[PDB]
Design a protein around this nucleic acid. Structure first.
Ligand SMILES: *OP(=O)(O)OC[C@H]1O[C@@H](n2cnc3c(N)ncnc32)[C@H](O)[C@@H]1O
Ligand SMILES: [Mg+2]
Ligand SMILES: [Mg+2]
Ligand SMILES: [Mg+2]
Ligand SMILES: [Mg+2]
Length: 642
DNA sequence: GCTGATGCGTC
DNA sequence: GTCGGAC
DNA sequence: GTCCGACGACGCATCAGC
C-alpha cells in the first residue's frame, strides 16, 4: 500500500492486507521478497523464520495468488521441478564478470573483494551500475525476476554466455536497496537464508491455513486461527502441516501442488495429488550410527533386518500402467536416458502379473567377466545423457531393497515386512543383473558383527539396518531418516586415518566468512623430499577449533609458495602456509585422482591419490612434516582396498 | 574440429 | 558425501 | 532428532577460445 522499502513481514499482529506493501491484484514487488529475506537471515530460530515467510505468503495469497508459485521458487532458489533439469549455467566466474561490467569495475578487484568478504551479494549491491541512467527502470517484480532466472537457464549452446550476462546486468541495473544482494546470492547458488525445503513447506501450510485461497475479495477470513485457543491452533496447524508434507513427499512438484491448493484447498489436496508411477518421490534416508550397541538403543526391542550397503547410485525405477519405464535419482532427476540397458531388462525382472511398480534400488557397476562388484569410480564413467544400449561398456547390476508401489497400491504406509515380502515374491533375480540385497534378520550381536565384516569383504560400505514392523513404513513426512547406516569408518577405533601437512588455506564463504573455510593438505614424498597435495579439507572441526586454526596458522602465512611444495592442478590457496601444522584426517577410502600429485607414479602413471569424504579429526602437535604420512604409505593404503 | 575450464550431479 | 550449530 | 548450510572428490557435459 506504500513503499516496499519499509515492508516488515516480521512485525507483530501482521495483517496480510493492511501490512502488505502492494495493492490488491498488483504484482508482488521483488523488494517485498528481499525484505522478507532480510528479516529471515537476521534471526536464527527456524520457527521465527517460518512465521516471517508465512506472513509474506498470506499477503501473496490474499492479494496476488498467481505470484505464489514464483515467490516459493525464489524462496527455495529452485528453477522448477527437479525432474525437468533446468539449471542456470552461470557460475562464480560469469556472475563476477557480470558484476564487474554492471558496476564498471575490474574483474580482478570484484573477485578479490568477494573472496575477502565471503559473499558476492554485498559486492553486487555496495557498488552502483554504470549503465544506469538518471531515470532508473521500473522496479523488479517477483514473477519478473523468476522468469528472468528461467530465461538465463534456457539459454544454451554457442554464444549463450554473453546473452546470460546481459540478462544479469539488466537485473542489477533495476535493483533497489537490498535487491542486488539476493539476486547475486541466488545466481551463485548460495542463497543461504537458513530456511529451506522443510521450513518453506511449513510456512506454506501455515499461510494457506490462516488465509485460505479462493475467497472473494476482500477476504472475509484473513486469520482463520484467531478464533482458536493457542493450543488448539498449534494442533490444527501441525495436522495441516502434515497433510502438505506427506503430499509433497509423494509428489515433490510445486507446479502440480500449487494450482490444486489455490483451487481446492489444502484439506482436499491428497485427493488430487497422489503417489503414482512416473512422478518421482522423496527417497527414504538413513542416520549414521556409532556401533551395534547404538543400533539396539535406537531400535530398542523392535525386530530389524540388516542389509549390505552397496556402493553405487540410487535408482528409483518406475514401471507405469501400460509399459513405460522411468528411472530417477535420489534427487528426483530423470536418469531414464542413462540406463537403456536397465529399461530393456525390466520384462526379465518382474513376473507377468506385475502391471506397475516403483522399486528402490542401488545401481552398481558389475564386471561380467569376473562376476564381481566394481568400485563407485568405475560406475561414474558411464555416460549420462542420451545413451544408446550398444555403446554401454560399464555394465550395471541392480540391488533392490524396497518396493513403494505395486499394481496400483501405494505401499507408503505399509510396514517393511510386507513391502519386502511383496518384493521377494513378485520379482525375479538374475545374478549380475537384478538381485535382492543380501540381508540378515537377527538380534544376535555376534552374528551382526560377523555380517558387517562380511559385507565389507564382499565389496560393500557396511550395513543398512531397518525395522520390520514397528515404525517401519515408507512415510518420509513422519521421518525422512528412518533407517540406520552402519559403516566401519564411523567408529572411533576403525577406519583409515592419515597425518597430513597443512600447506594452504582458502578464505571462507557464508558461515565461514571472515575466517578460513578450507585447507589444502599434503603427504610427504620421501624420495623427492617434497610435499605433495593430496586433498582439501573443510569439515570435522568445531567453530572453536576453527578459530584456533586461524590463530595458529596466521604466523605461517607466506607471500609465495615453497619450492618443495607441489600442488599441480589443485585449486591455488588464497593463503600459502609454511609447512608445519600436521592434522589427523579420516576418510572412507582413497581414490585415484586426476588432479592431485600425491603418490603419482606409485599406483598409476598419470594419477595421484586423494581422499574420499575427508574430515578433520585432531591436531597432531606431536608430529613434524617429516613424520607425516608418506606418499608410499598412501600408495600402500590404496592397494590394500583391493 | 579440438581442448581446458568448469558447470552439474553423483557420491 | 561428513560434519557441527541452533533449536 | 530435525533442519540447515559450511565444506570434500570425481567424471561426464558443456562452451569460449582457439
Ligand atoms: O551414506 P548414505 O546416507 O548416503 O547411504 C544411503 C544410501 O545407501 C544406498 N544403499 C545401498 N544399499 C542400500 C540398502 N540395502 N538399503 C538402503 N540404501 C542402500 C542408497 O543409495 C542410499 O541412498
Ligand atoms: Mg575462494
Ligand atoms: Mg553410497
Ligand atoms: Mg570433530
Ligand atoms: Mg562452462
Amino acid at each position: 500500500s506504500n513503499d516496499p522499502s519499509g515492508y516488515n513481514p516480521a512485525k507483530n499482529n501482521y495483517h496480510p492486507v493492511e501490512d502488505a506493501c502492494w495493492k490488491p491484484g498488483q504484482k508482488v514487488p521483488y523488494l517485498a521478497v528481499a525484505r522478507t529475506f532480510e528479516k529471515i537471515e537476521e534471526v536464527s530460530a527456524r520457527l521465527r523464520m517460518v512465521e516471517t515467510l508465512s506472513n509474506l505468503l498470506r499477503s501473496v495469497v490474499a492479494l496476488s495468488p498467481p505470484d505464489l508459485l514464483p515467490v516459493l521458487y525464489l524462496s527455495l532458489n529452485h528453477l522448477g521441478p527437479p525432474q525437468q533439469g533446468l539449471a542456470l549455467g552461470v557460475g562464480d566466474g560469469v556472475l563476477l564478470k557480470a558484476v564487474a561490467q554492471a558496476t564498471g569495475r575490474q574483474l580482478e578487484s570484484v573477485r578479490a573483494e568477494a573472496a575477502e568478504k565471503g559473499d558476492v551479494g554485498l559486492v553486487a549491491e555496495n557498488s552502483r551500475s554504470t549503465q544506469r541512467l538518471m531515470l532508473p527502470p521500473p522496479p523488479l517484480t517477483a514473477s519478473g525476476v523468476f522468469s528472468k532466472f528461467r530465461d538465463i537457464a534456457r539459454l544454451t549452446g554457442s554464444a549463450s554466455t554473453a546473452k546470460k550476462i546481459d540478462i544479469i546486468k539488466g537485473l542489477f541495473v533495476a535493483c533497489r536497496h537490498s535487491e542486488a544482494r539476493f539476486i547475486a546470492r541466488s545466481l551463485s547458488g548460495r542463497l543461504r537464508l537458513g530456511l529451506a525445503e522443510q521450513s518453506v513447506l511449513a510456512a506454506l501450510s501455515q499461510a494457506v491455513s490462516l488465509t485460505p485461497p479462493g475467497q472473494e475479495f476482500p477476504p472475509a477470513m484473513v486469520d482463520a486461527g484467531k478464533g482458536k485457543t493457542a493450543e488448539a491452533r498449534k494442533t490444527w496447524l501441525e495436522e495441516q502441516g502434515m497433510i502438505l508434507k506427506q503430499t509433497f513427499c509423494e509428489v515433490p512438484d510445486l507446479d502440480r501442488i500449487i494450482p490444486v491448493l489455490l483451487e481446492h484447498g489444502l484439506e482436499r489436496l491428497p485427493e488430487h495429488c497422489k503417489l503414482s508411477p512416473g512422478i518421482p518421490l522423496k527417497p527414504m534416508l538413513a542416520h549414521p550410527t556409532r556401533g551395534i550397541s547404538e543400533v539396539l538403543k535406537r531400535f530398542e526391542e523392535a525386530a530389524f533386518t540388516c542389509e549390505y550397503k552397496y556402493d553405487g547410485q540410487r535408482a528409483q525405477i518406475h514401471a507405469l500402467e501400460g509399459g513405460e519405464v522411468k528411472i530417477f535419482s535420489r534427487n528426483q532427476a530423470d536418469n531414464t536416458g542413462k540406463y537403456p540397458d536397465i529399461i530393456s531388462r525390466i520384462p526379465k525382472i518382474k513376473l507377468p502379473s506385475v502391471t506397475s511398480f516403483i522399486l528402490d534400488t542401488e545401481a552398481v557397476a558389475w564386471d561380467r567377466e569376473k562376476k564381481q562388484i566394481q568400485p563407485f569410480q568405475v560406475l561414474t564413467t558411464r555416460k549420462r545423457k542420451e545413451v544408446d544400449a550398444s555403446e554401454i561398456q560399464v555394465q550395471v547390476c541392480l540391488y533392490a531393497f524396497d518396493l513403494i508401489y505395486l499394481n496400483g497400491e501405494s505401499l507408503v504406509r505399509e510396514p517393511l515386512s510386507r513391502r519386502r515380502q511383496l518384493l521377494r515374491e513378485n520379482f525375479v533375480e538374475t545374478e549380475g543383473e537384478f538381485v535382492f540385497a543380501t540381508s540378515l534378520d537377527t538380534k544376535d550381536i555376534e552374528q551382526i558383527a560377523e555380517f558387517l565384516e562380511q559385507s565389507v569383504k564382499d565389496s560393500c560400505e557396511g550395513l543398512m539396518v531397518k525395522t520390520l514392523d514397528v515404525d517401519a513404513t515408507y512415510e518420509i513426512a513422519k521421518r525422512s531418516h528412518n533407517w540406520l547406516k552402519l559403516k566401519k569408518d564411523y567408529l572411533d577405533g576403525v577406519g583409515d586415518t592419515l597425518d597430513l601437512v597443512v600447506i594452504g588455506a582458502y578464505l571462507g564463504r557464508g558461515k565461514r566468512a571472515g575466517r578460513y573455510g578450507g585447507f589444502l593438505l599434503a603427504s610427504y614424498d620421501e624420495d623427492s623430499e617434497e610435499l605433495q597435495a593430496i586433498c582439501k579439507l573443510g569439515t570435522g572441526f568445531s567453530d572453536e577449533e576453527l578459530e584456533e586454526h586461524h590463530q595458529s596458522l596466521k604466523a605461517l602465512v607466506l607471500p609465495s609458495p615453497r619450492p618443495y611444495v607441489r600442488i599441480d592442478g589443485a585449486v591455488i590457496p588464497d593463503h600459502w602456509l609454511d609447512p608445519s601444522a600436521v592434522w589427523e584426517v579420516k576418510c572412507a577410502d582413497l581414490s585415484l585422482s586426476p588432479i592431485y600429485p600425491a603418490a603419482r607414479g606409485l599406483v598409476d602413471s598419470d594419477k595421484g591419490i586423494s581422499l574420499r569424504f575427508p574430515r578433520f579429526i585432531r591436531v597432531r602437535e606431536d608430529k613434524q612434516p617429516e613424520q607425516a604420512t608418506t606418499s608410499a604409505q598412501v600408495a600402500c593404503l590404496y592397494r590394500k582396498q583391493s
